[PDB]
Each structure stands twice: as structure tokens, then as C-alpha cells.
Design an enzyme around this catalytic site. Structure first.
Site, PDB file in Angstrom:
ATOM      1  N   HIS C  54      33.137  46.600  46.805  1.00 28.45           N
ATOM      2  CA  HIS C  54      33.788  47.949  46.865  1.00 28.45           C
ATOM      3  C   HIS C  54      32.693  48.789  47.567  1.00 28.45           C
ATOM      4  O   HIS C  54      31.507  48.408  47.420  1.00 28.45           O
ATOM      5  CB  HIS C  54      34.055  48.513  45.465  1.00 28.45           C
ATOM      6  N   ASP C  57      29.857  49.376  45.128  1.00 28.52           N
ATOM      7  CA  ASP C  57      29.127  48.175  44.642  1.00 28.52           C
ATOM      8  C   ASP C  57      27.813  48.087  45.435  1.00 28.52           C
ATOM      9  O   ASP C  57      26.776  47.820  44.813  1.00 28.52           O
ATOM     10  CB  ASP C  57      29.896  46.884  44.723  1.00 28.52           C
ATOM     11  N   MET C  88      36.307  40.471  53.354  1.00 26.68           N
ATOM     12  CA  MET C  88      37.149  41.502  52.758  1.00 26.68           C
ATOM     13  C   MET C  88      36.300  42.598  52.126  1.00 26.68           C
ATOM     14  O   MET C  88      35.254  42.320  51.484  1.00 26.68           O
ATOM     15  CB  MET C  88      37.916  40.794  51.605  1.00 26.68           C
ATOM     16  N   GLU C 181      47.051  45.486  46.658  1.00 25.95           N
ATOM     17  CA  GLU C 181      46.965  44.546  45.490  1.00 25.95           C
ATOM     18  C   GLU C 181      47.628  45.265  44.330  1.00 25.95           C
ATOM     19  O   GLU C 181      47.067  46.288  43.895  1.00 25.95           O
ATOM     20  CB  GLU C 181      45.490  44.214  45.190  1.00 25.95           C
ATOM     21  N   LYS C 183      49.397  46.046  40.453  1.00 27.34           N
ATOM     22  CA  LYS C 183      49.034  45.867  39.052  1.00 27.34           C
ATOM     23  C   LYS C 183      50.028  46.644  38.187  1.00 27.34           C
ATOM     24  O   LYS C 183      50.184  47.850  38.449  1.00 27.34           O
ATOM     25  CB  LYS C 183      47.646  46.503  38.743  1.00 27.34           C
ATOM     26  N   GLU C 217      46.746  39.183  42.483  1.00 29.03           N
ATOM     27  CA  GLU C 217      45.792  38.704  41.479  1.00 29.03           C
ATOM     28  C   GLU C 217      46.563  37.835  40.478  1.00 29.03           C
ATOM     29  O   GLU C 217      47.661  38.215  39.998  1.00 29.03           O
ATOM     30  CB  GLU C 217      45.126  39.845  40.716  1.00 29.03           C
ATOM     31  N   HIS C 220      47.130  39.629  37.289  1.00 31.37           N
ATOM     32  CA  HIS C 220      47.915  40.898  37.337  1.00 31.37           C
ATOM     33  C   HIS C 220      49.382  40.594  37.097  1.00 31.37           C
ATOM     34  O   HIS C 220      49.892  41.123  36.084  1.00 31.37           O
ATOM     35  CB  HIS C 220      47.651  41.794  38.528  1.00 31.37           C
ATOM     36  N   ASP C 245      43.502  36.830  44.901  1.00 33.09           N
ATOM     37  CA  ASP C 245      42.707  37.049  43.709  1.00 33.09           C
ATOM     38  C   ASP C 245      43.195  36.086  42.604  1.00 33.09           C
ATOM     39  O   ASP C 245      44.310  36.056  42.052  1.00 33.09           O
ATOM     40  CB  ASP C 245      42.697  38.516  43.340  1.00 33.09           C
ATOM     41  N   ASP C 255      43.832  43.455  31.153  1.00 37.48           N
ATOM     42  CA  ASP C 255      43.278  42.584  32.271  1.00 37.48           C
ATOM     43  C   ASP C 255      42.056  41.896  31.661  1.00 37.48           C
ATOM     44  O   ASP C 255      41.193  42.507  31.008  1.00 37.48           O
ATOM     45  CB  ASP C 255      43.161  43.451  33.515  1.00 37.48           C
ATOM     46  N   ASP C 257      40.726  38.791  33.195  1.00 43.15           N
ATOM     47  CA  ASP C 257      39.841  38.467  34.384  1.00 43.15           C
ATOM     48  C   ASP C 257      39.028  37.249  33.943  1.00 43.15           C
ATOM     49  O   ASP C 257      37.807  37.282  33.970  1.00 43.15           O
ATOM     50  CB  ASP C 257      39.042  39.662  34.784  1.00 43.15           C
ATOM     51  N   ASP C 287      38.382  36.915  41.482  1.00 39.10           N
ATOM     52  CA  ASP C 287      38.092  38.235  40.831  1.00 39.10           C
ATOM     53  C   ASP C 287      38.254  38.069  39.310  1.00 39.10           C
ATOM     54  O   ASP C 287      39.283  38.427  38.752  1.00 39.10           O
ATOM     55  CB  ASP C 287      38.864  39.407  41.305  1.00 39.10           C
TER      56      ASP C 287
HETATM   57 MG   LIG Z   1      41.693  42.120  41.917  1.00 35.15          MG
HETATM   58 MG   LIG Z   2      41.922  41.752  36.977  1.00 34.59          MG
END
Ligand SMILES: [Mg+2]
Ligand SMILES: [Mg+2]
Ligand SMILES: [Mg+2]
Ligand SMILES: [Mg+2]
Ligand SMILES: [Mg+2]
Ligand SMILES: [Mg+2]
Ligand SMILES: [Mg+2]
Ligand SMILES: [Mg+2]
Lengths: 388, 388, 388, 388
Positions: C54, C57, C88, C181, C183, C217, C220, C245, C255, C257, C287
């Protein structure tokens, strides 16, 4: 390659299982009825061990005792013909308009009265066929509406009902015991005694609880999205896992009643692992429906997937606990320490220790990483290489 | 018009409620940290009765025995100042990293041993503020994907904690009572004792079950998609509903903590019914979080909301069971009979009684329409009026 | 046994992944920040192929262009140092109070204005590092409340925003493309563009849709309980799967993950199978967050579980499609016929056939059992013997 | 007081609504089959505008060309008699066993080919009753656990059906319009085109997207746990909301089909808003099922319910957007600005404009509390009054 059910892995099937013609919310039976004599013959031949049945599965609702007696007789000729056992039996209390609104907990009082009777009529049968468990599944006990039923009143009736049945078995000196099988919903909006805990908590109020335990269905608890394995481990904790319903489901939706191993595979493994470890001694019972697209053989295919499945997992988890590497992942993960008591002998005297509060170094403990993503991946291969 | 609360509502708030800052799992904190003295002071204006707490809500993590004290005098001076009260206290055992695998059920013996000590420190406080009941919500007790916890050992461990707990509370004459606060998942993947049932059941395996009872949240059962009212009914039947946490939740999703009224509106009507028709005298504790999009009266109004909403709902249910036209309908669907014993004298000889079975007209009875749809409409025009 | 990521199975990780310190709703970071130079070094060494990031980040929010430039420089020294690529890139628009209430669709207009800008500042960067996909994840775009946002107005703004970004890329003649993306929720009550379909349907309204696609994702879509594989196959159908993802989740909840292969294993297999078959050419991007109980190495363990996992499945499904027996299960299941067109060449003239209506024998067709419980069990062993 | 409906409400009912008999997935039928002439006749009294249908609802499965006819004259004679109307028709392609793997997407070419023919038969009818719009709900299109369907081929197939469909409708000058009716699972495990989004997206891959539009159910999106209003907003933005199905659903669970108002009460307020504030002129179609516990006015009252509930909700929202005190609050949270272009003239040169970024005060803006909590309370006292 070729896992063999030997009538001693205790695989048993509810007659209604393979017997399911395929009729659903939205469609017509996609198959014909099977005759319970026919079923028994065919489970025997796959390596099964026994059948379980609702009254009505055996004895069609109209009961000319003549007819009826010549149903049971036909049945019973197969059991010895084949050597199959009937371990468990239940009552159908959810398909007749009568039951619209429950049985034990129906609004009207003679419907509660009829319903016990209907059930007392079959515990006896449960007795004669030498079943050792009498299961009870709510089904029409809950609230399709909203405040259409006062739940403590209703919960009084559930009690009254169970307290009368236990009295009969005591009385008659029968060697059964009950297993309340809970369910979140489907078909009543909200069913009463909806999880292993609820059922479990409820049993404690009954006159003789020592007579009562649970009969969890994998997919039933999955439907409230809960860990089944965690739920079953509680049951075992209570000395209450009296029977089990093994099937698959795909997360929160209608009762699917998929094959065992189907749906949530990781939870199958974790289940089986546990049943294999906590020594469940019971019947690896299956309550699944081969799907309605799925054909005369489809039924059996699906029947047999059920067994290949408990048998591979039974193995992959076997060669899991026995992996030295794995046993050194577990200790790395302080699972040995879970197993040790926090404050033993003579001691609520952690009060007087310093190593426990005043002096205890949080960041030391803080720093120690749990080592579970590594144990998980050992168990994710089923040990190494191979999956499971 | 507008429904102003007063002290005899017994409406409580956690300091962590209105005081939440915004730190979501993906954002920063959207609010300044508010102080106790402040918190207690506006609640008092809002119309609030008590205040609840966590150790760390009040006394900052590593504080001293003096930094402690000054906090406590200060908290204490503002209770009286405002004459507010603290009917319940609780221990934070889930935020600090030492509590990453749990408190009472950590796979690491001196954290286990440290969470008991930290708790005793707080019992003693709670104790001396006249807290009537002591809550306990795990949060770090579960597994994200376990092989990581033997649920049978954890329950051994879990039990041991509380038994130790109940000794001290009795060892020490406190007039305190434990209340297990269930939750399915978040922060853990699976939380031990995920619901009311599991918890209720658990208490019965404890060594002094009377010091226990349960503290439910609307959102927390909603995360399992249970039927909150139903659930509280089961706790008010067990006589185990020591304290409740009022809330709003919009489905099987992360812990929202919406203001009460918010979420399942309708679920909410049935709770105040239940709660109000059932005699709950305990506090109406609001464990809600003011959305992070909001400033201080953002905060100040949702919390107001919480209380008007109990009050409007109190109203509308009150009137529900007073619409003469509704009492007709409670008769109509026979709610009356649910409330009559099924088989009342000794009375298993209910057995030959040819009307229970032999001479019972299932065909006749099946035809009885339950008159549930019209009772449901009545409680919608909250009776024959303006909304519920 | 020992599956080897070779920088060419295209495994890439979002910097925020292994970088996750462990801070959650209810607790403190259980780990320290990793320095992106450090990360890159270490993914290179596991066989990774690239990092994704990001803005924030990389470049901490305060932007002294001096500092900033000496961040990117440090970064970029690693990419060639190690040979790692940045395929990406994305914008962080959900952690600063500013974003409280969205970015593209925030109530206030300069917040929508700031937010484009913030993002236009990084597409450029996305350009320079030669990334080929610029992902966009809503996060703060939805409704923590209820009617606090008029969704067509809001949906106008989403458009305005995307339509301006595409203009820049066109203009600047950049060789990126976007990936929305979606969610369902977490952290906003209800997020806008909540599933692959929504996102997909939305793209159609944009000035140049040929520039836009999705970035699903796994977990997601799992959160709305949907088939991911079915969802991804739609994406591929549309010529829109532009990035993916990969992570795990356990049914409807927050989430999680989880590692890839973790959570829903059968859906992993079915996913991978498809990605392997439908020729996705993209970066097998992960991710996930190694859980917060899970330690410095735990991170990498979890990193690597990710790869062992796509690699076994990639295999088990390889030796699945290539099983002669399996290829004779598929034909038995008329999957060859799905693949044939219903009404070809010159013909809406099924109208004039009889073999299609008037003469068609339903019960013939009725009778043919789909043969899917047998194909399923072939795929349930991963072929025969071995699982997957 | 009481809110009587009239013909200009445009309230419709499926014959299968009030006419459902009780056949659940676990019980028998609790009601006599009611006839069309009867159905049309009481609806007309209840205050209903139109009637919708399925082929097989009206014309019993295998009927003849004459048995057909007599049905149709009869249906027809009672429309006029009552002056009711039939704005929409639909084809049953999910109950009969030939439709066990689907209709348009069966893995068997002549069922595919038979479901097109059966549909054309009905278009022609619908056509000649002046049906304005033609619905289409799969139900048998999905997979219970697939390896069973390549979702890419099914979508090829699915598309082909409809394209064929749109030719005939245009070939044949009918003034008809297609409406894909999404649903996630049940009866299939996973249903192709599970939601509004997937469907919306799908229509854009069709060869005449203007003949399509979408027909949503509240319960059906609720099964995926979407945000119904949100969802309909996305369809009213796409200008693709041809028809709606009003309902009650209490969570991610089996298809309930509770009366409208029932389920998410609050979701419902926001829909009539949306629908009423947005100009939907289409019919308010009630696809609900009167609980099986109920007789004929059991049936007759829930269906009444459906309509008072639109009407009370119509009311209370109407007044919501007229409380001067509410309009203040729409300004307060800046709903106004959501409704202003972000960057309006050509206007990417928005780029250096030092206030968008350089000279923007994020710190200042972050501090703006959204005033969402007070707008939400206002729509609770439905404004400053008596319930919503
Ligand atoms: Mg993601
Ligand atoms: Mg997630
Ligand atoms: Mg069962
Ligand atoms: Mg089941
Ligand atoms: Mg709480
Ligand atoms: Mg909560
Ligand atoms: Mg519908
Ligand atoms: Mg429906």
C-alpha cells in the site's frame, strides 16, 4: 487405495438415509422408496454393522397391528439373515400435520399427549430389537412465528415429556438411554435446544440426567457456524456423547446432509482424530442423503463414500499423532503444559507466590510465540508429503 | 413524545463503551481518550444508574500501587459526587500480548497463573466498590485453527480457574457472583464456551454452580445466529441470568456493538417483553460502541438512544399484553395449554387412556390452524396502533 | 514430501502480510514492524517472486519528500539486490481518521478530493516500479450506520472517482489497469460493491471498462458464504480476473486472513484446479496474516505454508484431470454435453422439433441419474488412494 | 388506526403464495390445495391489484391442449370478473425430476432443449394475458458439491438460453421483458448467479441487455447476508430493477418466505424509502409463504399483513423525510455533498490545486464527527414520535 469397512468399524445407517426418494422444498421425489428389507441386505454387503430407524420408516403410519406385526417380522428376518444390528431407534414427530407445531412442546395438550404415546409405543420396540440408544430430535419444536410460544412454559413441557419417558424406561427396567439431537432451525424458524450446549445444559434439570445425553449431527452445529470438534469435545467432557450423526454441510444454509468427508474436510479430520483419541466407543453412525440427482447406484456410492472417508481420515490422523516430528511441534506448542494443572496440591497458594504476579515477567512470557502455524502445516500435509 | 430515563431504570454502561476511540482492526483511533471522571459525570446527566468496568479501563496497565490508588480515590470521589454506582466489574485478560493464547486456558502455565492473580487483584477492588456481580469474558480462549488446543484439557483448565475463583470469593466473605460471558469467535477463530448453552452446561460441572449464572450479549448470540430472546428464556428457566449486555447486531459478522434498538429491532421487542414480563431485576447493561464516524455528542447521543429504545420498547410490549384484542389471540392459539401440564397427577398412566392414542383424532387435530399469523400482526401494529 | 516454490510459480506477498504486528480489535501488537527491505530479502529467499504494497506500507504517512525519496530508494535497492518484482500496488484509504467515512465515497467533498490525489500520487509510483496492476479496496466505503448514505449518490461518486483515475492513466499513457477488490463488511457495516458480481456489474458503467477488472480475495466471498470458485469462474468468463488474493477463512465471521490451504480446503483444490485449467496467467498473490500468537518464524512458516499448499493442490488436481478413471466419470456425468451447444447453427428451430417437446420423453430423461457422487469421491481421494 | 390497500398500490401475489400447502422438507402438506378462481377472488377482496404465476401453478403438469384451455378460460373469466390483472408470469423449471440438474444449464442436452420449449409455451401465454414482465428463477441451476458443473460452460449455456429467449420475444412482437431472479443456494448447494450483482453483471454479457433487468427477493439476498436496500439501489442505478419480491427472512438460513414486514423490520423501512423515494412504479409482488401452522384465514391474514406493512412503512418513511428536524440532520452529516460531483468541469486538473492535497488539513477534516448516530435515532422515533 482401498479402505475396507469391516462390520467392526461400527458403520450404521438410518433407514431414511439411502431411502430418501429426493423430494425437496421445490421438487418431486427423484427416486423410488427402497423396502427396509432391501436396505438391510445392501448395507450388510457394503461392510455395514446396523440400521437405525424412525417408527414410520419401518411401520407406515396406519397401524393395523396385523400389518404392523407383519412389518417388524419381515424386518427382523433380515437382521439375522444378514447379521445386522439395530443399535438406535427414534420417533418420527415432524411429518404429519398433527405435529405442525411440535410434539413434546405443542400448544394443544392432547397433541403433547398423543406424541408421548406415539413415542412410548416405540421405546418398547426400541427395547425388543435390542437397540441401546433412543434418540430424540425436536424438528417441530420451535417457533416458525415469533412470540407464538412462551419458551419457559415450552421448556417445562420438554422437561415433563423427558421426565415421563425416563420414568417408563426405569419402570419397565429397560436398558436404553436417550440422546437429544439438537438443531438450530430448518424447519421451524428457531428450534428449541439448538446446540450441544443447550441440549447439554437442559439435561441437567431432568429427574435422572444420568439417563440422558446428546446425539450431535456434524452439519447441524455447522449451521450455527460452530466448531463441531469443539462441541463434541464438550460432550465427551460431560460424559455425554451417547451417539453421533456424521454427514457433511457447506457452512450456514439449509440442512444439506452431505456425505461424510464432504463439506468441511478439515473439521472431519479433527473430528475423527478426536473420536479416535477420546475413545468414543459408539457407532460411527451416518445421517446423510445421497443427493436427488444421484441415482439408484449413487445411493450406494454415496453410502460407501461415507466409509472410505472415515477410514482414510482415521488413518491420516493416525499417522499424525505418531509422527515424531509432529510430537515435537506439540511440545514446542506447550500442549504438554495445557495438560498440567495450573495450581495443584493443597494450593490456592499462588496467592503467596511472586513468580506468579509481583515478580512475573510479562514480556518474557509475551515473547514466547505459540508455535501453531508450524503444527498446523504438519497436520495440513497429513504428516509430510501426502495430504489429509 | 420523548421518554426520559431515571435511576430506577438500572441502566449501566461500561467505561469502555462511550469511551471507545475508534481503533478498529483496519483504522486508527478517531477519538480522544475520555476520562472516568468525565465518563461517570455525563452518564449521570444522561440518566444512568451505574457504571461497570475492566481493571485496565480504570487502572492503566503497568501502574504502581500508588498510581493505582490515585485512580481509585478519583473514580470513587466521582461516584458519590454523582451518586452513581458500580454493580459489576470485570478483568481485562485479552488485550496485552501475554494474553495471546488465552488467560485461564493459555497453553503456558505461568500466564494461566498470572491471569488468576490479576483477576484476584480485581475481585478485591470490585469487591470494595460494592460490585454485585463479577463478569468473565474470555476472548483469547479458543484457537484460530487448532491442533493447537485439546478442548478437553482446556475445559479441565477452564474449570480449575473458576473453582479456584469461587473458593477465594467464598474464602474471602465477598457477596460476589460469577457470570460467564459467552461468545462464538472474534478475536479467536473459535472461542471456547461459544454460547449461552455451552456456558450454562459448563456451570453445572463447576463445584459450586450457584456462584455462577450467565452474562449474555445480544450481538454475541447473534454471531452464531441464535434467537436471543429464546436464549435468555433458557437462562431464565435455569434461573441463571445474572446480568445481560444490551446491543445491536446486523447478522453473522464481526462484533458490531451497535446501540440497543439497533440491529434486530424486532428481536429487541421480544427481549424487553421477556425481560419485563419475567421480572429481571438486574441492571440493563449497555455494552455498545459509538460508531467511529462520530464525535463526542455522536458518542453522547447513541448512548442516549440505547435508553430511549429500552423505554419505547418497554412501552409497546406492555401495551401488547394489554390489548384486550391480543389476550383473545393468546387464547386462540392456546398459549394457555402450553402453560398446562401434559400429564398431571403421578401420571404415566396416561398409558391406556384411549384418547391419548387409540381414540385420538389426529385428523381432527391436524386441521387446527395455529393462529400465529394474526398474533404476529397484532405485535406489529404494536397492537392495533402505531409501530413496534 | 517437499514442494518447492521456484520464483516462477508466481508467488508474491503484500508487504502488509508478514509485516502484520498482531494488533486487533481486542489486543496489542504481538510483534514488531519488519522493515520492507528486510521483508523483500526474506521473501526472495523463500522462493517468492515479488512484493505488493500500500503507499503507507512503504512511505509512512508524513511525507517529507526528502524522507520519502530515501524510502523508495532504500526499497528499490532490494528489488534488484534480490531480483524481486513489484507486480501490483495499492492505496491505503482506511486507517487515518480522515477516511472514517470513506474515500471515493466520503460525505464531505474535499475528503473525496484528498483521497483521489492521495491515490493519483501512487499510481505514478505504481508506474515507476513497473507494477502492472493497481488495486482498489473500498474498506471505508459503506455504511457503519443505516440511511447515512444515499447509495446511488454514493455510487455516482465511486464512478466519478474511477472515471477520473482511468483518464489519468490514459492521459499519462501508463501501462497499468485497475482491480476493484470487493468485500461484504468488516469494517463498515455494509460495504459498497460487495461481491465479484457487484464489482463486475459496476465496472460496466465506467467510461472505459476495458481498463477495469476485479481482485477477489478467497475469504472475502466466503464471508457472504458464497462459492469462491463459482465467483472466480464468472470473473474469468467476463475476461476480468486481473489479480487474486489467496488466503483462508472459516465461514461467515470477521476477516481472518488465514494461510492459503487453511479454512475451506475443498474450495482451495477447486480453486487451484480452475486457475490451473482456465489458464490464469497472473501472480498467485497471498493476502494472509500469520496469526498473532505466531512468532518471528511463524511469520515465515505461515508464509511458506502458503506455498507448500498451492503446490500440493496444484498437483493433486493435476493427477485428477489426468486420471483415465476420472475422465470416465466426467463423461458418465455428461460434462461433455454441457460443453455442447443447446441450439446451434441457423437454429432457433428446436421450435419445429418434436424430439424437444411434443415427443420428448421426460421420464426417460428423468431416469438418467447425474453420476456426481461417484465423480466427487474420485476427487475426494485425489484420484485414488492419496487424498487431496 | 388501520391502513386499507387499494388497486393503485400495485400489490401482486403469486398463486403459489397463499396457495402453498405445507409440504416442507420434513413434513406433509398442512392445507388443502386452493384453486385459482378461489385465489383470484379473495385477493380481490383483500385489496390486491394483480396476480402472478408459474405454468404448472395454473396448468397442471401433463395436461392436454384442452385440459390446458379449460384452465386458461377459467383463469381468464375470473380476472375480468374481478378485474384483477397478471403483470408477470414465470415458468416452473425446478420441481419435476427431469429438472434435477437444472433447466437452461442441465448437463443433459435435451432437458436443456426441453426447458427452452416449455418456456416458449409459457411466454406465449404470459404474452396473451398482458403480463408486462417475464421472470426467471433457476433453482436447479448450481451444484451440491461440484466437479459436477464447469461454471464457465454453464454460463456459456445460461447465456445461450436467454439470447434464444430474447430473439423469440422480439421475433414475436411481444412487449415482454426478462428479469433474472437471483438466489445463492437452496435447492442447489450453490446456485449459479447467486445475487443481484452476479445477475446484473450477467445481463451485460447478453446480446440485448435492455430486455433484461432484475427481480430481487428480500429473503434471497438475506441468505447471502447482503444489504437488501443497498442492493436494490445498485439495481436502481443500473436502471435494471424491473420487479421486486417482498418478503421476511430472519438470517442466513433456509428460504423462509415470511410475510413482508417480517424478518429485518428495519431493513424494510429503508426499502419502502428507497422504493418510494426513488419512483419504483413496478408492482409490489409478494412472494411469501403463510406458515404451515395456520388454516385459510391464517393464510388470509398474513397476506393481509404483507400489505398493511408496506403501507405503514410507506407512511413512517414519508414522514421521516419531512420532519423539519430530520432535514437539518441530512445537512448536518452532509448528505448534500455526496450529491455533489467530486471534481466537476472536465476536471482532472484537480491535480495541482494545493487544497486537494498540499494545503489540505486532514487533521481538521478527521475531527469532523459524521452525525450519523442522531440521524439514526430520528429514524427510530420514526422521527420525534411513535415507532418505525
Ligand atoms: Mg485483499
Ligand atoms: Mg482479508
Ligand atoms: Mg440427525
Ligand atoms: Mg441433517
Ligand atoms: Mg459483553
Ligand atoms: Mg459485543
Ligand atoms: Mg421470488
Ligand atoms: Mg424466497
Amino acid at each position: 487405495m482401498s479402505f475396507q469397512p469391516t462390520p467392526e468399524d461400527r458403520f450404521t445407517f438410518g433407514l431414511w438415509t439411502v431411502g430418501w426418494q429426493g423430494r425437496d422444498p421445490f421438487g418431486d421425489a427423484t427416486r423410488p422408496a427402497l423396502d427396509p428389507v432391501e436396505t438391510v441386505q445392501r448395507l450388510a454387503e457394503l461392510g455395514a454393522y446396523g440400521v437405525t430407524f424412525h417408527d414410520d420408516d419401518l411401520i407406515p403410519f396406519g397401524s393395523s397391528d396385523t400389518e404392523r406385526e407383519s412389518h417388524i417380522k419381515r424386518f427382523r428376518q433380515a437382521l439375522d439373515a444378514t447379521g445386522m444390528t439395530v443399535p438406535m431407534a427414534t420417533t418420527n414427530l415432524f411429518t404429519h400435520p398433527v405435529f405442525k407445531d411440535g410434539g413434546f412442546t405443542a400448544n394443544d395438550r392432547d397433541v403433547r399427549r398423543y406424541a408421548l404415546r406415539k413415542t412410548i409405543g416405540n421405546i418398547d420396540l426400541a427395547a425388543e430389537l435390542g437397540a441401546k440408544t433412543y434418540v430424540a430430535w425436536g424438528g417441530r419444536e420451535g417457533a416458525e412465528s415469533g412470540g407464538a410460544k412462551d419458551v419457559r412454559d415450552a421448556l417445562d413441557r420438554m422437561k415433563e415429556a423427558f421426565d415421563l419417558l425416563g420414568e417408563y424406561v426405569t419402570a419397565q427396567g429397560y436398558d436404553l438411554r436417550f440422546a437429544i439431537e439438537p438443531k438450530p432451525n430448518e424447519p421451524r424458524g428457531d428450534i428449541l435446544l439448538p446446540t450441544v450446549g443447550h441440549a447439554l445444559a437442559f439435561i441437567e434439570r431432568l429427574e435422572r440426567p444420568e439417563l440422558y445425553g446428546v446425539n450431535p449431527e456434524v452439519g447441524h452445529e455447522q449451521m450455527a457456524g460452530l466448531n463441531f470438534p469443539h462441541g463434541i469435545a464438550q460432550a465427551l467432557w460431560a460424559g455425554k456423547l451417547f451417539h453421533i450423526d456424521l454427514n457433511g454441510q457447506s457452512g450456514i444454509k439449509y440442512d444439506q446432509d452431505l456425505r461424510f468427508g464432504a463439506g468441511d474436510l478439515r473439521a472431519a479430520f479433527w473430528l475423527v482424530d478426536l473420536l479416535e483419541t477420546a475413545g468414543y466407543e459408539g457407532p460411527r453412525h451416518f445421517d446423510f442423503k445421497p443427493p436427488r440427482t444421484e441415482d439408484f447406484d449413487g445411493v450406494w456410492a454415496s453410502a460407501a463414500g461415507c466409509m472410505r472417508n472415515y477410514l482414510i481420515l482415521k488413518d491420516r490422523a493416525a499417522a499424525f499423532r505418531a509422527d515424531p516430528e509432529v510430537q515435537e511441534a506439540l511440545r514446542a506448542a506447550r500442549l504438554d503444559q495445557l495438560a498440567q494443572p495450573t495450581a495443584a496440591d493443597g494450593l490456592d497458594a499462588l496467592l503467596a507466590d511472586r513468580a506468579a504476579f509481583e515478580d512475573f515477567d510479562v514480556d518474557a512470557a509475551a515473547a514466547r510465540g505459540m508455535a501453531f502455524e508450524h503444527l498446523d502445516q504438519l497436520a495440513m500435509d497429513h504428516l509430510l508429503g501426502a495430504r489429509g
